[model samples]
Target: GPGSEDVWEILRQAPPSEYERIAFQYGVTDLRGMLKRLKGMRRDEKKSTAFQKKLEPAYQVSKGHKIRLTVELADHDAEVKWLKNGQEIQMSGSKYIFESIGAKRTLTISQCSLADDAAYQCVVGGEKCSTELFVKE
Candidate 1:
């Protein structure tokens, strides 16, 4: 009893890739159905919930001041795109830095300028949040 129970537990914790091997060894004829179930479970676990905006509207900053805009998501590890005025933003330049800490995503801007005054948005999983940067002259 202990031997069979231990094997079952090990298989349950193993990855889906091991399903075929375990099934053949254990003489499980309905391995295909189990594999399908395992695949679906993996897909559901990786799905991301809708994005939530953590910061409020209207961030006021003086010229040359540094500011950060943040967004929250159920899974921050999910891919996120930063856009300014509907154009995609890149992190290669020093003016903008994108950072993700757990479920929080932030875009930090240094030396805020009047030109930076626009609608900044963060998009993840087809869900997006936008906020305007009000630069005080």
Candidate 2:
């Protein structure tokens, strides 16, 4: 009545190490949310459509100014790599941080020019997410 077997079934299919990662990836916050999604799947109707909304593109810096990329790491060995326009970017000393483990890490932009207008990619293990930021003149 409160929870469904199908809920546990879905999470059971995931590798034990990936359970939390998958839950957060699907916008699930609490155990109740996880159960809601699983139960919703069994029904012909949606239990909640809130997670269907998209995250608005945000600029962490002033328009046309330098920006620092921040990421929240997941899993034990999770790593984040940066790429500009499909080209790999090398990090200086301050560009990388692994000490935070499951916390936020920041990577700064040493310099920015028109050539930096290309899409920026953040690849973390199986997750590949990107953003296209246009700086103001």
Model 1: weakest 10-residue lDDT segment is 45-54
Best-matching candidate per TM-score:
1
Cα-based lDDT at residue 62, candidate 1: 93
Query: Which candidate achieves the best lDDT against the true structure?
Result: 1
lDDT (tens digit, per residue) of candidate 2 on 1-137: 35534435556687766776766665554645665687878868632122221112444444446666555554434556677668876665543322333444455664454555556666665555566656544
Model 2 spans > 4 angstroms off = 1-64, 92-102
Question: lDDT tens digits, residues 1-137, model 1?
Answer: 64563445556777777866776677665567766777887775432346755456679999999888888786756767788889887775888987778877888898889988888877775677678999988
Backbone clash tally (model 2): 0
Cα-lDDT of candidate 2: 0.54
lDDT of 1 at 34: 61
